[PDB]
Design an enzyme around this catalytic site. Sequence first.
Site, PDB file in Angstrom:
ATOM      1  N   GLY A  58       0.807  -1.199   0.000  1.00 56.26           N
ATOM      2  CA  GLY A  58       0.000   0.000   0.000  1.00 56.26           C
ATOM      3  C   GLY A  58       0.843   1.253   0.000  1.00 56.26           C
ATOM      4  CG  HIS A  73      -2.469   8.798   4.757  1.00 56.48           C
ATOM      5  ND1 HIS A  73      -1.877   9.996   4.795  1.00 56.48           N
ATOM      6  CD2 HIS A  73      -3.628   8.946   4.018  1.00 56.48           C
ATOM      7  CE1 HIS A  73      -2.628  10.840   4.124  1.00 56.48           C
ATOM      8  NE2 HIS A  73      -3.675  10.202   3.663  1.00 56.48           N
ATOM      9  CD  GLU A 104      -1.098   1.689  -4.582  1.00 61.56           C
ATOM     10  OE1 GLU A 104      -0.951   1.954  -3.394  1.00 61.56           O
ATOM     11  OE2 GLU A 104      -2.177   1.308  -5.030  1.00 61.56           O
ATOM     12  CB  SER A 120      -8.622  10.558  -0.832  1.00 56.82           C
ATOM     13  OG  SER A 120      -8.486   9.566  -1.859  1.00 56.82           O
ATOM     14  CB  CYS A 121      -6.331  14.446   2.666  1.00 62.40           C
ATOM     15  SG  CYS A 121      -4.720  14.887   1.907  1.00 62.40           S
ATOM     16  N   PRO A 178      -3.927  -2.400   3.590  1.00 67.37           N
ATOM     17  CG  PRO A 178      -5.406  -4.215   4.068  1.00 67.37           C
ATOM     18  CD  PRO A 178      -4.280  -3.362   4.647  1.00 67.37           C
ATOM     19  CB  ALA A 181     -11.710   5.159   8.675  1.00 68.38           C
ATOM     20  NE  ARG A 212       1.289  10.796   7.273  1.00 67.31           N
ATOM     21  CZ  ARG A 212       1.686  11.332   6.101  1.00 67.31           C
ATOM     22  NH1 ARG A 212       0.990  11.380   4.971  1.00 67.31           N
ATOM     23  NH2 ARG A 212       2.849  11.961   6.128  1.00 67.31           N
TER      24      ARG A 212
HETATM   25  C1  LIG Z   1     -12.481  12.035   0.353  1.00 67.00           C
HETATM   26  C2  LIG Z   1     -11.637  11.645   1.583  1.00 67.00           C
HETATM   27  C3  LIG Z   1     -11.120  12.646   2.393  1.00 67.00           C
HETATM   28  C4  LIG Z   1     -10.397  12.340   3.542  1.00 67.00           C
HETATM   29  N1  LIG Z   1      -9.851  13.331   4.257  1.00 67.00           N
HETATM   30  C5  LIG Z   1      -9.116  13.108   5.370  1.00 67.00           C
HETATM   31  C6  LIG Z   1      -8.645  14.168   6.136  1.00 67.00           C
HETATM   32  O1  LIG Z   1      -8.670  15.323   5.708  1.00 67.00           O
HETATM   33  N2  LIG Z   1      -8.013  13.904   7.357  1.00 67.00           N
HETATM   34  C7  LIG Z   1      -7.816  12.567   7.764  1.00 67.00           C
HETATM   35  O2  LIG Z   1      -7.105  12.322   8.736  1.00 67.00           O
HETATM   36  N3  LIG Z   1      -8.274  11.552   6.997  1.00 67.00           N
HETATM   37  C8  LIG Z   1      -8.915  11.790   5.838  1.00 67.00           C
HETATM   38  N4  LIG Z   1      -9.461  10.723   5.087  1.00 67.00           N
HETATM   39  C9  LIG Z   1      -9.263   9.332   5.543  1.00 67.00           C
HETATM   40  C10 LIG Z   1      -7.897   8.829   5.106  1.00 67.00           C
HETATM   41  O3  LIG Z   1      -7.723   9.124   3.714  1.00 67.00           O
HETATM   42  C11 LIG Z   1      -7.745   7.335   5.376  1.00 67.00           C
HETATM   43  O4  LIG Z   1      -7.916   7.128   6.767  1.00 67.00           O
HETATM   44  C12 LIG Z   1      -6.374   6.792   4.978  1.00 67.00           C
HETATM   45  O5  LIG Z   1      -6.167   7.005   3.589  1.00 67.00           O
HETATM   46  C13 LIG Z   1      -6.249   5.295   5.237  1.00 67.00           C
HETATM   47  O6  LIG Z   1      -4.970   4.857   4.802  1.00 67.00           O
HETATM   48  P1  LIG Z   1      -4.696   3.306   4.524  1.00 67.00           P
HETATM   49  O7  LIG Z   1      -3.263   3.177   4.176  1.00 67.00           O
HETATM   50  O8  LIG Z   1      -5.227   2.553   5.685  1.00 67.00           O
HETATM   51  O9  LIG Z   1      -5.665   2.913   3.306  1.00 67.00           O
HETATM   52  P2  LIG Z   1      -6.116   3.419   1.854  1.00 67.00           P
HETATM   53  O10 LIG Z   1      -6.006   4.896   1.809  1.00 67.00           O
HETATM   54  O11 LIG Z   1      -7.447   2.821   1.608  1.00 67.00           O
HETATM   55  O12 LIG Z   1      -5.005   2.853   0.843  1.00 67.00           O
HETATM   56  C14 LIG Z   1      -4.734   1.471   0.637  1.00 67.00           C
HETATM   57  C15 LIG Z   1      -3.738   1.452  -0.506  1.00 67.00           C
HETATM   58  O13 LIG Z   1      -3.196   0.131  -0.696  1.00 67.00           O
HETATM   59  C16 LIG Z   1      -3.501  -0.334  -2.036  1.00 67.00           C
HETATM   60  N5  LIG Z   1      -3.776  -1.773  -2.101  1.00 67.00           N
HETATM   61  C17 LIG Z   1      -4.829  -2.398  -1.555  1.00 67.00           C
HETATM   62  N6  LIG Z   1      -4.758  -3.710  -1.749  1.00 67.00           N
HETATM   63  C18 LIG Z   1      -3.630  -3.889  -2.408  1.00 67.00           C
HETATM   64  C19 LIG Z   1      -2.957  -4.992  -2.782  1.00 67.00           C
HETATM   65  N7  LIG Z   1      -3.512  -6.172  -2.494  1.00 67.00           N
HETATM   66  N8  LIG Z   1      -1.756  -4.956  -3.366  1.00 67.00           N
HETATM   67  C20 LIG Z   1      -1.156  -3.793  -3.606  1.00 67.00           C
HETATM   68  N9  LIG Z   1      -1.770  -2.660  -3.267  1.00 67.00           N
HETATM   69  C21 LIG Z   1      -2.969  -2.700  -2.676  1.00 67.00           C
HETATM   70  C22 LIG Z   1      -4.675   0.498  -2.502  1.00 67.00           C
HETATM   71  O14 LIG Z   1      -4.621   0.692  -3.919  1.00 67.00           O
HETATM   72  C23 LIG Z   1      -4.434   1.831  -1.803  1.00 67.00           C
HETATM   73  O15 LIG Z   1      -3.593   2.693  -2.590  1.00 67.00           O
HETATM   74  C24 LIG Z   1     -10.205  10.993   3.910  1.00 67.00           C
HETATM   75  C25 LIG Z   1     -10.723   9.986   3.088  1.00 67.00           C
HETATM   76  C26 LIG Z   1     -11.429  10.302   1.921  1.00 67.00           C
HETATM   77  C27 LIG Z   1     -11.905   9.163   1.021  1.00 67.00           C
END
Ligand SMILES: Cc1cc2nc3c(=O)[nH]c(=O)nc-3n(C[C@H](O)[C@H](O)[C@H](O)COP(=O)(O)OP(=O)(O)OC[C@H]3O[C@@H](n4cnc5c(N)ncnc54)[C@H](O)[C@@H]3O)c2cc1C
Length: 447
Positions: free
Chosen positions: A7, A10, A32, A41-42, A111, A297, A303
Amino acid sequence: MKVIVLGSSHGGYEAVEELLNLHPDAEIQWYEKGDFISFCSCGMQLYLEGKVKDVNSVRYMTGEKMESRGVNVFSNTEITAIQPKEHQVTVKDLVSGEERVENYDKLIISPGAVPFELDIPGKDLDNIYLMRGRQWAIKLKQKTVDPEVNNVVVIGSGYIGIEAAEAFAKAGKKVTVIDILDRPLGVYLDKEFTDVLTEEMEANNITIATGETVERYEGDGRVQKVVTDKNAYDADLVVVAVGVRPNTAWLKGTLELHPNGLIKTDEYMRTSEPDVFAVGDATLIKYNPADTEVNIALATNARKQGRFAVKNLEEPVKPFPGVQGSSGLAVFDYKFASTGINEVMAQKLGKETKAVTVVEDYLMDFNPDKQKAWFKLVYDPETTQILGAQLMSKADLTANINAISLAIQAKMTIEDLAYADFFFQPAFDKPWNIINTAALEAVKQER
Ligand SMILES: Cc1cc2nc3c(=O)[nH]c(=O)nc-3n(C[C@H](O)[C@H](O)[C@H](O)COP(=O)(O)OP(=O)(O)OC[C@H]3O[C@@H](n4cnc5c(N)ncnc54)[C@H](O)[C@@H]3O)c2cc1C
């Protein structure tokens, strides 16, 4: 030591950062499945409102930068499965179709989550959009200037739904927000706050239809109507911002998951299997206001968890400190922030709380720049410890919620905050600032 990180968002990104300063020696592979590394997406709201012109700049890292640092970055490569005992993952190069098995010493997966869709009749006629990622950002932006889009309906009245509703209202469209819940943003704010925000949104031609179940989308080829149990609304575009589903179905049978799909992890970010750690939206996090694990979430959470997975890579030596659920946002002229327990949180957890709300000018009477601010302090009825706070004003006072987050973590009480030393200078605040004033009111309420 070879560490594979899944991934580039963050959670995965901070794991690679902490590996780079705690284990410079390691062979690090970053995977990725998408095309673009570390899109934020923030920043989607700033882009949709035209504040940011280039969608490709709404990112915080590039693959090229990480490669310069010695990381092996693999974009357009998906991790298809994990074989935890033999410490292998099968990866699929999505541009060539070639699959290969890769071995690891430690695996950190982040993920994420995927937008929840409504599975109803009409489910996907054209122009039923979702809001996460670069591709959806681009398509939503094209709809902002489309002359055929006049009515947009967003389903969901949380953070993401209200950002979309503001972005389309500002682009001149008529917006209806539909939700089963009775107040927009209820998860973040209590009624005295959402009542002010509802009036503000209605003044900018957003209708809020609360307490309604969407039953079907009607339209010929593309959406034209959204009909609920109570009503029918014309729609040229629907933005579904109802919630998010953990991206974990591919892990069923490999790692232990909760009934709702979330990965089980402990306070050192370890999964049910040796040497695989899990972070981010797909996990629960220690929530200090109520001493329980809750799924929150947020980017901040992912982070911090990402760095703690690397700290516990070899030995479970550093338990996660917990978080307060702090969030903040601007909705038209109002800037708000909240942390800890509010009414919806107390109901879900079965927690009893007391609160005081102070609504007054945050500057002294003689200062012509004075404006109203709302501050609600939530505390435990027995110990009077701080459990949460919510603040709102057209002036930006949101950084004050950072002090409340620490106060909850430190288990301070209303008496501690009533007399806490906060600076005074009449261009910034009153002799007893916004936190002191609400706590002083709480002390009087408990006398
Ligand atoms: C519109 C929007 C606005 C937001 N604004 C804020 C904000 O301002 N402040 C705040 O704190 N939070 C905000 N958030 C929430 C924040 O974006 C999420 O909490 C954060 O992105 C989660 O990170 P993550 O790494 O857990 O997952 P995700 O962001 O869901 O990313 C997972 C990544 O891993 C990849 N991946 C998944 N499976 C596989 C695989 N099997 N193999 C290889 N790659 C894969 C995906 O493609 C993706 O790129 C917002 C969310 C959205 C949708």
